[PDB]
Amino acid sequence: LINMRRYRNAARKLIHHYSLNSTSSTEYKISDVVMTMIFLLRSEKYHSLFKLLETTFDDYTCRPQMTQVQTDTLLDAVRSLLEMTIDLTTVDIMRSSFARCFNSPIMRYAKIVLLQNVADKRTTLEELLIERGEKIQMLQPQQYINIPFCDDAEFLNRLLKHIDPYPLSRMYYNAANTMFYTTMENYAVSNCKFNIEDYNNIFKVMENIRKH
Amino acid sequence: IMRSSFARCFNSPIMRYAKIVLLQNVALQRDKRTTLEELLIERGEKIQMLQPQQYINSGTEIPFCDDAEFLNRLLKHIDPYPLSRMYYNAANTMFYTTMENYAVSNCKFNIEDYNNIFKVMENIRKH
Amino acid sequence: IMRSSFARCFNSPIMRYAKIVLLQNVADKRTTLEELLIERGEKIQMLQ
Amino acid sequence: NKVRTVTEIVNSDEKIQKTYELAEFDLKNLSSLESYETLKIKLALSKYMAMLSTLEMTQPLLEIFRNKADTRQIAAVVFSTLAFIHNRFHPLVTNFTNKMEFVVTETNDTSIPGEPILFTENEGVLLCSVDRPSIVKMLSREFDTEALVNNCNVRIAKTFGDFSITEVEATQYLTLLLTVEHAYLHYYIFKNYGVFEYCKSLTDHSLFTNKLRSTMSTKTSNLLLSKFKFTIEDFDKINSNSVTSGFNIYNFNK
Amino acid sequence: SLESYETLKIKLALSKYMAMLSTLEMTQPLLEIFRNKADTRQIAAVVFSTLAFIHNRFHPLVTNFTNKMEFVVTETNDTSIPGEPILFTENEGVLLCSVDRPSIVKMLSREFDTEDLSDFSITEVEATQYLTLLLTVEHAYLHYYIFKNYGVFEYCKSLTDHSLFTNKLRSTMSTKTSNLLLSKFKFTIEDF
Amino acid sequence: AYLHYYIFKNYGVFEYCKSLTDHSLFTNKLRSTMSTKTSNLLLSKFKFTIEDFDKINSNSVTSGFNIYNFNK
Amino acid sequence: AYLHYYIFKNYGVFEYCKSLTDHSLFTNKLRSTMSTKTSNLLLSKFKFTIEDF
Amino acid sequence: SLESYETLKIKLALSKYMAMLSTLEMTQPLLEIFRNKADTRQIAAVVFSTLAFIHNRFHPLVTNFTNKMEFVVTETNDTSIPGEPILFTENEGVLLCSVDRPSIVKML
């Protein structure tokens, strides 16, 4: 007999991280993987997800064939587990993450990786720039534009009072990690090499900008 | 023993995606002013965590130079240089750096202590 | 206290010199001195 | 207030005197206070929220970006954010570029991986691209709102002695503001140095330091992303795949 | 001609410090070393030998000095002591040195008021920087000597209360302390 | 308790709550006035030490550099 | 090359990089206090100007 | 006679540079070294010691110099800086030198 609630909570947290649906950085151990897999097996309506993630043990065995109703049901199951949008690419992210976690060896220090192996056309940033630029130029513009900056002291005072208890550092961390994860997921989904040199050089540019 | 091995294994961290880590840009001090003593205690605690480096001199003898020609030559080169202006510049840059550090550190500057620093003048003159 | 002390004595290996320890593993909320200071200070201010 | 210093040497009665103006030291001390910089950033964010409010944009940003049908609100929000950032850079122009067009993207097939807001010239007018699903995914992601990022003594001493804006909403506002700030830096290089330099910058952000510090570093305020030093966890290990036996003689970006 | 004799005193002392720094086998001028955070060995050597030179001046019978020194080169503000760029002490008989590099860089990089064939020449800025570093290490040595002569507690109390420079400096060793260039000038602060 | 209370009354609530978490401030806030005016303290009659203090403290060891060792 | 190197040491790799493209730092960042020092260079013994014709 | 004194200044400086190059133990004249792409050590030594000589002239109190130098001898155009045949900098405290050999050969 196992505790359904604890296993469900561990599964929820680990899947939240492994789906890139949350920026909560909590050190995850092998125990959380064991709990999430056991809960996935035990719960009847998560059997599809459990089989999906268990197929990742061998790299040569790929995703089971699911008819549209099965994919929709699994999407509803994932949504219920996360109580949050969620779609097929989230499932692909989860599959890749769990595959890399499972095939990884037992080790003393957490391994830091980047999203990869999701979604034939292995491209770079510039070819995508050209192609999507042409495609965007194809698209018809929707709105044509042809400005109040009020400094109402009382209103800004009330806004500051509302914002004052918020730990600015936490807000910056959340925003930066959200932008980073969205950029990485867009790169991986588009099958484009994510050049972290450029992304880190963005921060380096900000740092060099400040001190002048 | 197998249970202990499994306990060590289950606490092993798993792979995680990278995250953007925030580092403090400038050691910004808090609103409440601090005195020199509390600042000294805090900064000494911070220094304790640093890793000291070993310096090994070639020999124990005090460095020195008895080359006359070089000594009178340096003296001649610095001869047209007034001592008043040199000492004034040195003292004022020392004072400015001290005051800047005090202001940045949000620490109260005791004028009397800084004045007492340079009372060895009268101590020498009187005795 | 007795249970913790005897547990640590039993699980300790046979050794030639007496092992000096401090009390631990008695009584969820792992706290420090300052959080306790704040909490018990509020609770004491509650008391008439 | 001014402070006077006197130096006296033992060879004469001469005294050389200098006057220091305390306002400089007070300014440094104020700039060294954490609460001061926190107030500056929070006041910028509050001004942004007030600017949105006076434009009826009171609905949460996530709800604004989740509405596929109503494009006018998305275009107005992005334009207002761009104008706010432009005014922050140049506190003399209240109206942004007087004419520009907006196109909203709902497909991955025509999406740019990492630059959700992009700018282009259709030979007649500025055009701005908005990747709506990317911004929706950004704002809808769950935030870490219980963890603490690193004074207990003042709290101990104290113990011994109306628009509903949640933390999630404020984080969403800051996220959109930073995204539009990045877009505006790209747009500034565009407008001031040509399409060629803009598309060069899109693939190499390192040109920002040279094309901003020449004018912006001495004339405008501080940038929002410069409030904290951001680094990627275990950056060296992940970058080990691309390592050069280098010889950097033009290391213009430390 | 007594004032000329005293100026000769001070300038000869400064020239001897200059020549010691020359003999110490320097690759760059002082300021240049202090902006080079990559090479802490040279900064430590300069500070240590200035301390040794001051020690010999204060104690003319002492001809050698310890050959080891634990040192930390301060880089960040949260580990820097305002008003004390260099601090000397020892623990278990091992000399302990702390150098605030950014502070000394700011000290030597200020703009100072400026009211034969071999091409040798010394600028005013260089000489004044030399005197400034000598004075700073000399203040550090005063704190160090208070430590040795009256305990780590008198050292710590003097770090916060500098009147021990005039109380604990007895008149018997007035001739000894007069050897310091810090005693050749007075600097006072008056509100205005 | 009276040493804590003396720091309280003479240096404020902030210093009192600072002392509650760090007793090492006693040496600085007592020796300035008490060490030369009052009698000897009762706990100073004997030198008290914890048995095998170094071994138990080995959990918290610093590669230290103490320049303000105001408490030997 | 040594002038560029000395600009590097005295004012940062950024001043070095900016001087690599803008050589007016040879006359701005070369303060008159070290004029005697820079006069020791043989590069200071001559002037070379370029005039359109 | 001030112009004669200044010419004596300049020519004595040039002669001292000449004598330093002589003491540096050269097998060939400068141009000859610079056309010898097979021996980069000699070119690096010449450039490094000229840098050291200039450093001593600019800083008369400096008598020694670093004993290590990372150097690259440029051969192709796509790795050459126009107008800057030799460039000095350092990274992690290690002197970094770049020499454009064809440019200097054309100069001499």
Residue numbers in the entry:
A (entry chain C): 113 to 196, 200 to 234, 238 to 264, 269 to 334
B (entry chain D): 208 to 334
C (entry chain C): 208 to 234, 238 to 258
D (entry chain A): 7 to 156, 161 to 171, 198 to 290
E (entry chain B): 38 to 152, 195 to 271
F (entry chain A): 219 to 290
G (entry chain B): 219 to 271
H (entry chain B): 38 to 145
Paper text:
The most well-studied baculovirus is Autographa californica multiple nucleopolyhedrovirus (AcMNPV). Baculoviruses have their large circular dsDNA genome packaged into an enveloped rod-shaped nucleocapsid. The BV nucleocapsid structure consists of three parts, a central helical sheath containing the viral genome, an apical cap and a basal structure attached to both extremities of the helical sheath. Herein, we report high-resolution cryo-electron microscopy (cryo-EM) structures of the BV nucleocapsid combined with de novo modeling and Alphafold predictions.
The inner part of the basal structure has a C7 symmetry and functions as a plug closing the void created by the peripheric C14 anchor complex. The C7 ring, like the anchor-2 complex, is also composed of the two proteins Ac101 and Ac144. However, a major difference in the C7 plug involves one of the Ac144 (Ac144_1) monomers, where a kink is introduced between residues S38 and L39 in the long α-helix (residues 28–60). This kink results in a large re-orientation of the lower Ac101/Ac144 module (Ac101_2/Ac144_2) leading to the formation of a closed plug structure instead of an open ring as in the anchor-2 C14 ring. While the inter-subunit interactions involving the dimeric domains of Ac101 (residues 122 to 219) and residues 160-170 of Ac144_1 remain similar to the anchor-2 configuration, the globular cores of the lower Ac101/Ac144 module now face each other directly. This organization is stabilized by the C-terminus of the upper Ac144_1 (residues 270-290). In contrast to the basal or apical anchor-2 complexes, where this region of Ac144 is disordered, it is ordered in the C7 plug allowing it to interact with the lower Ac101/ac144 module of neighboring units. These observations at the C7 plug for Ac101/Ac144 proteins further expand the conformational space this modular assembly can adopt.
